[PDB]
Amino acid sequence: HPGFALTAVRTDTFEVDMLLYSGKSCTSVIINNPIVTKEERDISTTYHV
Amino acid sequence: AMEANIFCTFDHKLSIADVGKLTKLVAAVVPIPQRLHLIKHYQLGLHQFVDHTRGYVRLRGLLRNMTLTLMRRVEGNQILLHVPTHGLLYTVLNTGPVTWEKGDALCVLPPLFENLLTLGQWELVLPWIVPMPLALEINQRLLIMGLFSLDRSYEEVKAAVQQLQTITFRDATFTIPDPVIDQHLLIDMKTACLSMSMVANLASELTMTYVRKLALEDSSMLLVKCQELLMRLDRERVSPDDEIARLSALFVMLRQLDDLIREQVVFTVCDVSPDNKSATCIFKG
Amino acid sequence: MDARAVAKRPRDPADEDNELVTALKAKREVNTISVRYLYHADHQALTARFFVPEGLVEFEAQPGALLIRMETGCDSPRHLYISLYLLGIRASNVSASTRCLLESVYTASAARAALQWLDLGPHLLHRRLETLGCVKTVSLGITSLLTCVMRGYLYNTLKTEVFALMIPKDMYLTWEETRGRLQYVYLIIVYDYDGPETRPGIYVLTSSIAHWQTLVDVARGKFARERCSFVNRRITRPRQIPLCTGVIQKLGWCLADDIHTSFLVHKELKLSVVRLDNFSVELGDFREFV
Structure with missing residues (x-):
């Protein structure tokens, strides 16, 4: 025995399934139409929606 | 609406493997000696300029004259090449020994070392695309190895050349070929x-x-x-x-000295992917 | 291949319906995505996006900052994208009060690490810095995103507003009493060979001179003391070979009447700048002069 008595602390991770409750129309979500922004690379183009 | 491409044709008959081999190079940098609309396969690439008495200096000087084209489309009986215009954005294949990163300035160098396509006494030797600092370092290495070429009887000099010969860059190391082959220095490097x-x-x-x-x-x-x-x-x-x-x-x-003292930037890079084989670049003349 | 087809005027690319509209019309399908107008379709500016940590984006959150790529000595974060402002802490021409202000703004591990990685190696600044374009968009985050312009104007998605290039005042140079209409913008790094450690000056120069040799002549006149410092070091200090007294690279063009003075507010600190109101980006490489 050395003269001291260490105390160890560690963190463990658990994989969890959660359930959520929310009320009817508890938040109103305002949206518009999805739009396309063009970004042309040369050999192919990418369209951002 | 169509675009202004160049047409190339092969005298050799092509197998399906050859055509499939070409379709992998659909963004490569294929240089052409002159601005022509219909050319034969012989004029593609550096194979027409190869010789057994000249070296890197001569081919670098010859590359500076050529017109740089990007391959665009591959089909039976035809290859379509695009000649890019300054200030526009283009996709280019990484074929050199080094990885590019965004913001780089790329320049075209002679190559120093499925496979590439050969048909007869023919071979498609494409130029090296490397960032400008690597090209400058390579050129200086080659020049110094040339100057040491007359003291090669001593082991100190040979160790010096072996140190000159290995070069390290972004997570890659490669050994450039010694300009001295068969104990004597080629005439172009000799003149330089x-x-x-x-x-x-x-x-x-x-x-x-x-x-x-x-x-x-x-x-x-x-x-x-x-x-x-x-x-x-x-x-x-x-x-x-x-x-x-x-x-x-x-x-x-x-x-x-002017051919070696300065080299042109031909691209600047902006694209990153696991697909790193290619990037999008803007062309510079 | 007939005269009617040759003499026919070209189609207007704006009157043609897009690839998406042509497909949806071909099958007569409908989509919730709206594909009639494509944003950024007629932008002639070439742009790229750079991801940068939160610590570097001070003074860059407002459009108009010049973005410079610095290479660290190490392998993992091989390059950092720093602005001309953070580079101003290294400059010698920046007044000590402005330098204290900048140092008070950039107080994160990323910015101080950028400065350390700069001062640590033996190379000069320009053999260590690659110039990207100027910036116009920011989304904030612990790893932030900046869109940068490689060749073009700086403007909104609809070109409804056009951005200027911001130069910190101590870095701004002008060399003619009256400016001509069109004037080109250069970035100059000039090295002073005083004593133990080469001291750099960082300048941004607007001049109508486009020819290289005339510009290098007037620069050799304006920086004669640095040239004398270079040769005097070469004579007094052998075996430490110096290269370049300075480097010039061209990074844009502007109109003489679009130069105005302004201030940038950040952390309630005011940094006074010189602005180029319709700046166009057109980058060259570094040219070294002696």
């Missing part, structure tokens, strides 16, 4: 080294006479310090037509 040494030698003797006279006048008090430095290097160790001849020789040797 001889011109470098001649410009140095001519400057060493010629500059003092002019520096004295012009430093007498120089209000910048810079040329006096220049003459002092010349006096120092002197201390460490002519007919007028001959003065004209030596000045003309100095400037002609400098013009001989």
Whole structure:
């Protein structure tokens, strides 16, 4: 025995399934139409929606 | 709406494997000697310029003349090449020994070392695309290895050349080929080294006479310090037509160095992917 | 291949319906995505996006900052994208009060690490910095995103507003009493060979001179003391070979009447700048002069 008595602390991770409750129309979500922004690379183009 | 492409045709008959091999190069940098609309397969790539007495210096000088085209489409009986225009964005294949990163300035170099396509006594040797610092380092390595070429009887010199020969860059190391093959240096590298040494030698003797006279006048008090430095290097160790001849020789040797002294940027990079084989770049002429 | 087809005027690319509209019309399908107008379709500016940590994006959150790529000595974060402002802490021409202001703004591990990675190696600044374009968009985050312009104007998605290039005042140079209409913008790094450690100056120069040799002549006149420092070091200090007294690279063009003075507010600190109101980006490489 050395003269001291260490105390160890560690963190463990658990994989969890959660359930959520929310009320009817508890938040109103305002949206518009999805739009396309063009970004042309040369050999192919990418369209951002 | 169509675009202005170049048409290339092959005299050789192609197998399905050859065509599939071409379709993998649909963004490569294929140089052409002249701006033509219909060319034969022989004029693609550097294979037409290969010789067994010339080296990297000659091929670098020849590459600077050519027109750089990107392959665009591959089909039976045809290859479509696009000649890019300055300031526009293009996709280019990474074929050199080094990984590119965004913001790089790329330049075209002769190659120093499924596979690539050969048909007859034919081969599709594409140029190397590397960032500008790597090309500059490679050129300086080759020049110094050329200057050491006459002391190769000693092991100290050979260790020096083996240190010159290996180069390290972004997570890659490769060994450039020694310009000395069969114990003797090729004529193009020989001329490059001889011109470098001649410009140095001519400057060493010629500059003092002019520096004295012009430093007498120089209000910048810079040329006096220049003459002092010349006096120092002197201390460490002519007919007028001959003065004209030596000045003309100095400037002609400098013009001989011009191919190596400076290299052009042809692209600048902006794209990143696991697909790293390619990137999108803007073209520069 | 007939005269009617040769003499026919080209189609207007704006009157043609897009690839998406042509497909949806071909099958007569409908989509919730709206594909009639494509944003950024007629932008002639070439742009790229750079991801940068939160610590570097001070003074860059407002459009108009010049983005420079610095290479660290190490392998993992091989390059950092720093602005001309953070580079101003290294500059010698920046007044000590402005330098204290900048140092008070950039107080994160990323910015101080950028400065350390700069001062640590032996290379000069320019053999260590690659110039990207100027910036116009920011989304904030612990790893932030900046869109940068490689060749073009700086403007909104609809070109409804056009951005200027911001130069910190101590870095701004002008060399003619009266400016001509069109003037080109250069970035100059000039090295002073005083004593133990080469001291750099960082300048941004607007001049109508486009020819290289004339510009290098007037620069050699304006920086004669640095040239004398270079040769005097070469004589006094052998075997430490210096290269370049300075480097010039061209990074844009502008109109003489679009130069105005302004201030940038950040952390309630005001940094006074010189602005180029319709700056166009057109980058060259570094040219070294002696």
